Amino acid sequence: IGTKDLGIDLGTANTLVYVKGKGIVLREPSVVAIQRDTKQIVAVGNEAKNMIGRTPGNIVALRPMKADYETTATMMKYYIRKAIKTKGLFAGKPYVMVCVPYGITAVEERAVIDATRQAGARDAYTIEEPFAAAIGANLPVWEPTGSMVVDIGGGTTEVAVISLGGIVTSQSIRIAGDEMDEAIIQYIRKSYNLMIGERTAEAIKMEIGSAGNPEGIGNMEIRGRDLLTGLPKTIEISAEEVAEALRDTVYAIVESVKNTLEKTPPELAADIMDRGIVLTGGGALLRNLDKVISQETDMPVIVAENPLDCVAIGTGKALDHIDLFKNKARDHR
């Protein structure tokens, strides 16, 4: 009982490790450096970032979280080892709670667990990302009343209705932050014959992006490739245009919220109408998305406190409930 148990959120962009009794102790990019020819991972996280910055050549920089067995095991080994400052004398390895995407299958869950134990966990358990998000957002997930979370990440939006320590109904769509970026890229290509890159698209979304009602958000000067001449060009784009670019993405997200509500038992949907829907993840920060989802569902919608950290916090808080997740894993044997 001397080694502190761990919760790990291996996110698409950032990895966060929660240590029982200590909180978030590790905040590192979900990045790996591999040897360009032998495809071997030579650094992880901040160490990969530092090595990339020293440009030693013969290295390739990768974001492997969108994982295969050996990459998970290698990344887990690094993060577990780095987060644990001291070991127990009689049991030097932690129990580890691993955040996994919604809809993970049984065989996949056993593979994640195996990779985590290979990485040095005494034993390992999994928790679905929207359930971790609801726990970390402080929703009353253990009570017999309905709670709703909408976790908008990079590659997926997950919607879940929670009650009594479990997901009652849920939906996941592959429409999130990455797809907002792509919609912006495609709108600018079609409207201005201009090809922008990923950095500029993300910057546009962050600086003047919104889900609707973009009054006073402002305009931005952007640079990219004139598709006629192939030379770089600068134009000014408006928050109004960006809002129109993001419309189909936003309403796909709204549709997934509605579709989940439609599959939801009436009394749980009634509870949510009363307490409100909570948005988590980086995509929850899209200006006015809460207002748009609220307007389209006639339900209260709030952005969670600490929306970027909710999943990792909930993965750590799940350590006070290991019996539940123990039982969940034995279901998926």
Residue numbers in the entry: 4 to 69, 74 to 340
Q: What does the original paper state about this entry?
A:
In vivo, MreB proteins form discrete, nanometer-long, membrane-associated polymeric assemblies along the cell cylinder that move processively around the rod circumference together with proteins of the cell wall (CW) elongation machinery, forming the so-called Rod complex. We successfully purified a soluble form of MreB from the Gram-positive thermophilic Geobacillus stearothermophilus (MreBGs) and elucidated its crystal structure, confirming the classical actin/MreB fold and the presence of the small hydrophobic loop shown to mediate membrane binding in MreBTm and MreB5Sc. We also show that the interaction with lipids is mediated by electrostatic interactions and by two spatially close hydrophobic motifs in the MreBGs monomers that comprise the small hydrophobic loop and the N-terminal end.
The crystals belong to the monoclinic P21 space group and contain one molecule of MreBGs per asymmetric unit. Monomers of apo MreBGs display the canonical fold of actin-like proteins, characterized by four subdomains IA, IIA, IB and IIB. Subdomain IA (blue) of MreBGs is formed by residues 1–32, 66–145 and 315–347; subdomain IB (yellow) by residues 33–65; IIA (red) by residues 146–181 and 246–314 and IIB (green) by residues 182–245. Loop β6-α2, which connects subdomains IA and IB and closes the nucleotide-binding pocket, is partially disordered in apo MreBGs. Crystal packing analysis revealed straight protofilaments characterized by a subunit repeat distance of 51 Å, similar to that observed in crystal structures of other actin homologs. However, because of the open conformation of MreBGs, domain IB interacts with domain IA and not with domain IIA as observed for example for MreBTm. We noticed that in the crystal structure of the apo form of MreBGs this short hydrophobic N-terminal sequence is in close proximity to loop α2-β7, which in MreBTm carries the hydrophobic residues L93 and F94 involved in membrane binding.
